[PDB]
Structures are given as structure tokens and as C-alpha cells.
Design an enzyme around this catalytic site. Structure first.
Site, PDB file in Angstrom:
ATOM      1  N   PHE A  95       2.334   9.811   3.159  1.00 25.12           N
ATOM      2  CA  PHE A  95       2.766   9.605   4.544  1.00 25.12           C
ATOM      3  C   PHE A  95       3.319   8.218   4.831  1.00 25.12           C
ATOM      4  O   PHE A  95       3.957   8.027   5.864  1.00 25.12           O
ATOM      5  CB  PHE A  95       1.712   9.976   5.563  1.00 25.12           C
ATOM      6  CG  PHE A  95       0.495   9.057   5.579  1.00 25.12           C
ATOM      7  CD1 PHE A  95       0.467   7.916   6.350  1.00 25.12           C
ATOM      8  CD2 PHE A  95      -0.613   9.308   4.798  1.00 25.12           C
ATOM      9  CE1 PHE A  95      -0.618   7.085   6.322  1.00 25.12           C
ATOM     10  CE2 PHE A  95      -1.722   8.495   4.801  1.00 25.12           C
ATOM     11  CZ  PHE A  95      -1.711   7.392   5.593  1.00 25.12           C
ATOM     12  N   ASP A  96       3.049   7.235   3.961  1.00 23.67           N
ATOM     13  CA  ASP A  96       3.572   5.885   4.216  1.00 23.67           C
ATOM     14  C   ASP A  96       3.520   5.098   2.927  1.00 23.67           C
ATOM     15  O   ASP A  96       2.704   5.365   2.039  1.00 23.67           O
ATOM     16  CB  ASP A  96       2.738   5.216   5.275  1.00 23.67           C
ATOM     17  CG  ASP A  96       3.380   3.969   5.865  1.00 23.67           C
ATOM     18  OD1 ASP A  96       4.554   3.809   5.735  1.00 23.67           O
ATOM     19  OD2 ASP A  96       2.675   3.203   6.552  1.00 23.67           O
ATOM     20  N   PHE A 116      -5.729   5.688   0.346  1.00 27.74           N
ATOM     21  CA  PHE A 116      -4.806   4.576   0.142  1.00 27.74           C
ATOM     22  C   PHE A 116      -4.952   3.977  -1.224  1.00 27.74           C
ATOM     23  O   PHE A 116      -6.079   3.846  -1.751  1.00 27.74           O
ATOM     24  CB  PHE A 116      -5.051   3.452   1.143  1.00 27.74           C
ATOM     25  CG  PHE A 116      -4.789   3.816   2.572  1.00 27.74           C
ATOM     26  CD1 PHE A 116      -3.519   3.676   3.138  1.00 27.74           C
ATOM     27  CD2 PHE A 116      -5.812   4.284   3.371  1.00 27.74           C
ATOM     28  CE1 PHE A 116      -3.284   4.006   4.461  1.00 27.74           C
ATOM     29  CE2 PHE A 116      -5.577   4.630   4.709  1.00 27.74           C
ATOM     30  CZ  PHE A 116      -4.316   4.472   5.238  1.00 27.74           C
ATOM     31  N   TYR A 135       0.809  -1.189   0.000  1.00 34.15           N
ATOM     32  CA  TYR A 135       0.000   0.000   0.000  1.00 34.15           C
ATOM     33  C   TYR A 135       0.856   1.259   0.000  1.00 34.15           C
ATOM     34  O   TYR A 135       2.036   1.262   0.364  1.00 34.15           O
ATOM     35  CB  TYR A 135      -0.937   0.046   1.216  1.00 34.15           C
ATOM     36  CG  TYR A 135      -0.205   0.291   2.514  1.00 34.15           C
ATOM     37  CD1 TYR A 135      -0.114   1.545   3.073  1.00 34.15           C
ATOM     38  CD2 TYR A 135       0.433  -0.734   3.192  1.00 34.15           C
ATOM     39  CE1 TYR A 135       0.586   1.774   4.246  1.00 34.15           C
ATOM     40  CE2 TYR A 135       1.126  -0.512   4.377  1.00 34.15           C
ATOM     41  CZ  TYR A 135       1.226   0.752   4.882  1.00 34.15           C
ATOM     42  OH  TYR A 135       1.936   0.896   6.046  1.00 34.15           O
ATOM     43  N   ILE A 158      -7.074   0.176  11.190  1.00 31.70           N
ATOM     44  CA  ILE A 158      -8.224   1.088  11.199  1.00 31.70           C
ATOM     45  C   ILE A 158      -9.431   0.429  10.560  1.00 31.70           C
ATOM     46  O   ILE A 158      -9.349  -0.455   9.694  1.00 31.70           O
ATOM     47  CB  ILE A 158      -7.892   2.432  10.508  1.00 31.70           C
ATOM     48  CG1 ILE A 158      -7.390   2.246   9.072  1.00 31.70           C
ATOM     49  CG2 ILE A 158      -6.907   3.216  11.401  1.00 31.70           C
ATOM     50  CD1 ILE A 158      -7.253   3.535   8.333  1.00 31.70           C
ATOM     51  N   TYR A 214      -8.449   7.542  12.189  1.00 24.94           N
ATOM     52  CA  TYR A 214      -7.866   7.968  13.454  1.00 24.94           C
ATOM     53  C   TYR A 214      -8.677   9.060  14.152  1.00 24.94           C
ATOM     54  O   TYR A 214      -8.254   9.528  15.214  1.00 24.94           O
ATOM     55  CB  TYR A 214      -6.377   8.317  13.305  1.00 24.94           C
ATOM     56  CG  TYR A 214      -5.551   7.104  12.943  1.00 24.94           C
ATOM     57  CD1 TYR A 214      -5.157   6.203  13.892  1.00 24.94           C
ATOM     58  CD2 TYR A 214      -5.232   6.866  11.631  1.00 24.94           C
ATOM     59  CE1 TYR A 214      -4.386   5.086  13.568  1.00 24.94           C
ATOM     60  CE2 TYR A 214      -4.460   5.742  11.271  1.00 24.94           C
ATOM     61  CZ  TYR A 214      -4.096   4.865  12.267  1.00 24.94           C
ATOM     62  OH  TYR A 214      -3.368   3.753  11.867  1.00 24.94           O
TER      63      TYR A 214
END
Ligand SMILES: COCCO[C@H]1CN(CCOC)C(=O)[C@@H]2CCC[C@H]1N2S(=O)(=O)c1cc(Cl)cc(Cl)c1
Length: 128
Positions: A55-56, A118, A45, A75, A101
Site C-alpha cells: 500500500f505504500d 512494514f 519503508y 501511528i 488505524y
């Protein structure tokens, strides 16, 4: 871009129909079977914030992210979204904060009230 497109054109995959988790299938996967609750799922992902920043990424780590589906290990949007995927599928998910979150966020990276985007590839799933 892709986040706008899933926002405006995605399917609401929530049971509640509260537009909290929106999905587009980008790369159609194999057959009809989706993972079942408790399966070990292997994904790749990337994630972006609504400020446009990545961010990731698991790709950047050179190894997949592995979790047990439907157990609250991720999540809510991920338990809901990955459960809809076929092996080999790539999708885009848009995750409102209520399925992510929330108002707390998760510092340092995830702000309060963050809608997350995502791209997710379901590599494999297996029962244990
Ligand atoms: C370096 O860690 C990478 C994998 O992080 C998971 C974090 N979790 C589980 C913990 O929070 C409930 C997640 O549920 C989601 C979805 C699965 C993949 C990663 N996240 S994330 O991309 O939203 C994320 C990434 C980073 Cl770098 C930090 C935080 Cl707080 C969340």
C-alpha cells in the site's frame, strides 16, 4: 512469507505485552544507541496489508519519511517500533489495529481493523 514469519516468530515490543506490535531485526544496525524522544528520524519503508498488497513505499518516492519520534506524529506502532531501532537497522514490524488505524481505518487505503506489515530502515536520527 515475511508477514507470517514476524507474526509467528517476532518479539512483542509492547510495554503491555498485548502482542500488538511484533518485531524482527532483519539487518543489524550500528552500535547500541537508539533515538530519543523528540529526535528527527529519517526512514525508508514499505507497507503491506493483510490481503497481500503493497500500500505504500518511500523508496518509490525517492526520498525518506521524516518525523519527530515519540510525539504521536505517526501511528503508535511506529513510535514504539522506531524507538527500538539502531542507526542502519532494517526491521519488520507487525502492527495490530489498536496500534495503527483501529476500527476507523483510513480511507481509501487502510481498511477497518487492519493489521499492517512494514519493512523499516532507520537511516539517521538527530536531535534538533
Ligand atoms: C504519502 O504519505 C506517506 C506517509 O504516510 C505516513 C502516514 N502516517 C501518519 C498519519 O497517520 C497517523 C503514519 O503514521 C503511517 C506510518 C508512517 C508512514 C505513513 N503511514 S502508513 O504507511 O501507515 C500510511 C500510508 C498511506 Cl499511503 C496512507 C495512510 Cl492513511 C497510512
Amino acid at each position: 512469507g515475511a508477514p507470517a514469519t514476524v507474526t509467528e516468530q517476532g518479539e512483542d515490543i509492547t510495554s503491555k505485552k498485548d502482542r500488538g506490535v511484533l518485531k524482527i531485526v532483519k539487518r543489524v544496525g550500528n552500535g547500541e544507541e537508539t533515538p530519543m524522544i523528540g529526535d528527527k528520524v529519517y526512514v525508508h519503508y514499505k507497507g503491506k496489508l493483510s490481503n497481500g498488497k503493497k500500500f505504500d513505499s518511500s523508496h518509490d518516492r525517492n526520498e525518506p519519511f521524516v518525523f519527530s519520534l515519540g510525539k504521536g506524529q505517526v501511528i503508535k506502532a511506529w513510535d514504539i517500533g522506531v524507538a527500538t531501532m539502531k542507526k542502519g537497522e532494517i526491521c519488520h514490524l507487525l502492527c495490530k489495529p489498536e496500534y495503527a488505524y483501529g476500527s476507523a481505518g483510513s480511507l481509501p487505503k487502510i481498511p477497518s481493523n487492519a493489521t499492517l506489515f512494514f519493512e523499516i530502515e532507520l537511516l539517521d536520527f538527530k536531535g534538533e
